[PDB]
Amino acid sequence: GPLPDAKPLVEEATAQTKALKSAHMVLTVNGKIPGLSLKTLSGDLTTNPTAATGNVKLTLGGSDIDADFVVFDGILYATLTPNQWSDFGPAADIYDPAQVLNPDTGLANVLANFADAKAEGRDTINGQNTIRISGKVSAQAVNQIAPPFNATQPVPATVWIQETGDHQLAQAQLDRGSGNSVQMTLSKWGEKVQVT
Numbered sequence: 001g002p003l004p005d006a007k008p009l010v011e012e013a014t015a016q017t018k019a020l021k022s023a024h025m026v027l028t029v030n031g032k033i034p035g036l037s038l039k040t041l042s043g044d045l046t047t048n049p050t051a052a053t054g055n056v057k058l059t060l061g062g063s064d065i066d067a068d069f070v071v072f073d074g075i076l077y078a079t080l081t082p083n084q085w086s087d088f089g090p091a092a093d094i095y096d097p098a099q100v101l102n103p104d105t106g107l108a109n110v111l112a113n114f115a116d117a118k119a120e121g122r123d124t125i126n127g128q129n130t131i132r133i134s135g136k137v138s139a140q141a142v143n144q145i146a147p148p149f150n151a152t153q154p155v156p157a158t159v160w161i162q163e164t165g166d167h168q169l170a171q172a173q174l175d176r177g178s179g180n181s182v183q184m185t186l187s188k189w190g191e192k193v194q195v196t
């Protein structure tokens with residue numbers, strides 16, 4: 001049947017995202033984004049205070065490493081060899097994961113700077129009906145959430161917003177062209193992170 005108007009849905013998702021404290025996130029990098037050596041990540045994030053835990057697949061020196069990670073008390077830790085925790089210092093010197101849910105600079109700021117929104121279709125994301133929406137995100141909003149994009153123009157993007165219910169952002173993708181793109185799927189909004 002007919003699609004809703006994207007614009008009110010984006011506005012509603014913006015407000016919902018600003019109110020978020022925590023979520024489960026799955027992040028995938030498709031192709032190659034210069035200065036991003038991550039391939040995948042899956043984890044749980046809470047904010048105020050910031051903590052995160054999960055697993056990451058990343059490339060270091062031409063090799064893919066699977067690692068568990070914890071961010072706790074500003075500090076990033078990861079197991080670059082199995083069951084061995086290394087301390088990598090302040091998480092903020094690499095990337096503070098709270099930035100993803102910062103209401104001024106994170107996903108909500110992406111949504112508020114998502115231009116030309118148009119509903120394209122319906123898709124299931126994690127068992128929920130969502131509206132797939134195309135648009136373009138400002139360079140400045142992209143660079144603030146994902147510095148390695150190094151955008152000097154608007155970035156084509158797709159968002160998937162819950163059709164009913166709370167209208168959360170279920171998924172977002174930023175396309176750097178060719179077959180190079182970053183996507184995040186969010187779920188379990190307001191989960192207790194558990195702790196670390």
Ligand SMILES: CCCCCCCCCCCCCCCC(=O)OCC(COC(=O)CCCCCCCCCCCCCCC)OC(=O)CCCCCCCCCCCCCCC
Binds near residue numbers: 045
């Ligand atoms: C809608 C889309 C939403 C997108 C939201 C998030 C987008 C991603 C944010 C961009 C990350 C920017 C961080 C710098 C990029 C980096 O990779 O450095 C490149 C250097 C090579 O680049 C350079 O040459 C120099 C950069 C200096 C980096 C120093 C590295 C020190 C080595 C030790 C790190 C190993 C532990 C990492 C475990 C995570 O080699 C490295 O890869 C080593 C560092 C790996 C960092 C992984 C960052 C994790 C992203 C977390 C956000 C996801 C949400 C979290 C939810 C829980």
